[PDB]
Design a protein around this ligand. Structure first.
Ligand code: NA
Ligand code: NA
Ligand code: NA
Ligand code: NA
Lengths: 412, 206
């Protein structure tokens, strides 16, 4: 517990930019793109107010647009007077991907008709299209093979305080070991993480901070309408914060909370607000109506695990169950506890053989061990129960491919 | 099965893609359906064997579906998963190993079930070629059949050896195969693929 992330003061003018969304559309062969910029303002509307959106590729301006406020007619009552939608045409855009993370810079200016700048905001823009077609997850028209890993925010000395240097070290190691994707383990991450993933080229699964593993029967809260407001806040605020990051390709509704009607509601909400990213969720059997991707946890390659209500089929069998057409991406597989990762080659043979097996995220990146000191002051790595902590789960906090100080294990 | 097989054509569908041969093929299909449609034991119609894939096959598939909608229609021709079959019916597709031939690949049956857009059941029209001392790996097929709901089994090739009886100078009979009658270019012992001998004595593989 504590104030474990940054604290800051922000000063804005009374007439201000309150929100802006960016969206990219493409033609069939990705030769033509249209940058969609919707800007919302707060304060008093004046006729002299204008909004300018300019797209910069490194140092040269490639597109720009200016408009007064006032959107298109929405319904019988009219349109949004405090919103403006800018459309920019880009010829032969450079596409963003983990292999080649081409980025543009978008600058949004709120200014007067005479040319006086009031306030500016900016974001990095990546041109990429994620969609599921005919049972395959496609990025820029090509089917992805996910070489992913689950990553907690953990530092052996500072606990759950994250800093830029540790994040950069993690990204470098992951890329050097042929990972191209990361799953934010069961909560939204530090804001700089998505910027770094944009710049260095990693695909990101962004997860809402919802996990009710300890309930019996695990959906007691997520099937209760009285808890719908809190869950909705946790989902909608994450989507509002992170929707402009090109590295975020998939939304996740949480982790290990069963399956409740609240999950279906929030899945539909995300699909309505942000249709440019697929939504996944593992809870309640990994193939429910609240997921676009079959995302089992620790499903085996060839052996079935028939649990009563939530069976873990083998992934090959899972693909061909009657009526099933979705792609399969394991959200957790190859538990890396200690001396582990036996049978990894079988998973990757399966991934390469089957088109609809599009990979998975290993559990997990880094051990969650903490540093203690002996009577001589020599540090040593501690796990559950070493602090006298109330009922604990001993060494199950260390499942990483690297040590807490980022030294590789042999399984890496 | 209708009495249509053009295995020896190059390409295999040279006749079945030709409208001039449509009347003959149509006779062979429609007369069989007219003769046998009342038998309860007949559960599936088949359009023939090893004739490629031609438009004539699509036409006759639709004709059968119109006249007798109470039985599914299958056909292995070119690919085993074309538009002229209700059932994926490959020939000698293996359990776990793919066989990537250029135009008509033989995927492993498990992989075949999950190819994008594929929803049909899979029943092998021929598998476990029982030539001589054979049927190794049969248990793998049956493990697969029991594990996967959409793998609904198959037909072994085949029941009885096609050997003929000849007699020596002493008059003692002996079993003969392909080239033993002086016949024009032959395929030797490939006529004997049965689980039982020609006189219906079981082989060990049975
Ligand atoms: Na694959
Ligand atoms: Na653990
Ligand atoms: Na079966
Ligand atoms: Na034969």
């Amino acid at each position: 517990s504590g104030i474990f992330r940054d604290v800051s003061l922000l000063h804005k003018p009374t007439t201000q930019i309150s929100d802006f969304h960016v969206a990219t559309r493409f033609n069939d062969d990705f030769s033509r793109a249209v940058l969609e910029a919707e800007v919302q303002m707060c304060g008093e509307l004046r006729d002299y107010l204008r909004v300018t959106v300019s797209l910069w590729q490194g140092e040269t301006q490639v597109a720009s647009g200016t408009a007064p406020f006032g959107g298109e007619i929405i319904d019988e009552r009219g349109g949004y007077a405090d919103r403006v939608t800018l459309r920019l045409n880009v010829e032969n855009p450079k596409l963003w991907s983990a292999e080649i993370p081409n980025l543009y810079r978008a600058v949004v200016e709120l200014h007067t008709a005479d040319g006086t700048l009031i306030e500016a905001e900016a974001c990095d823009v990546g041109f990429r299209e994620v969609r599921i077609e005919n049972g395959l997850l496609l990025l820029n028209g090509k089917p992805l093979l996910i070489r992913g890993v689950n990553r907690h925010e953990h530092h052996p000395l500072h606990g759950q305080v994250m800093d830029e240097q540790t994040m950069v070290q993690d990204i470098l190691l992951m890329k050097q070991n042929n990972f191209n994707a990361v799953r934010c383990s069961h909560y939204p991450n530090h804001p700089l993480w998505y910027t770094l993933c944009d710049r260095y080229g990693l695909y990101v699964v962004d997860e809402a901070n919802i996990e009710t593993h300890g309930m019996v029967p695990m959906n007691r809260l997520t099937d209760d309408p009285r808890w719908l407001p809190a869950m909705s806040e946790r989902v909608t605020r994450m989507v509002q914060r992170d929707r402009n990051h090109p590295s975020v390709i998939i939304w996740s509704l949480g982790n290990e909370s069963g399956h409740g009607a609240n999950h279906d509601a929030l899945y539909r909400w995300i699909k309505s607000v942000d249709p440019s990213r697929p939504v996944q969720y593992e809870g309640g059997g990994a193939d429910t109506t609240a997921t676009d991707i079959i995302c089992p946890m620790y499903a085996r390659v060839d052996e079935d695990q028939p649990f009563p209500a939530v069976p873990k089929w083998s992934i090959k069998k899972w693909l061909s169950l009657p009526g099933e057409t979705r792609p399969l991406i394991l959200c957790e597989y190859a538990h890396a506890m200690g001396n582990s990762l036996g049978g990894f080659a079988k998973y990757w043979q399966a991934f390469r053989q089957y088109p609809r097996l599009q990979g998975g995220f290993v559990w997990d990146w880094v051990d969650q061990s903490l540093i203690k000191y002996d009577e001589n002051g020599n540090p040593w790595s501690a796990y559950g129960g070493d602090f006298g902590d109330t009922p604990n789960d001993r060494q199950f906090c260390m499942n990483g491919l690297v040590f807490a100080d980022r030294t590789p294990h042999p399984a890496l």
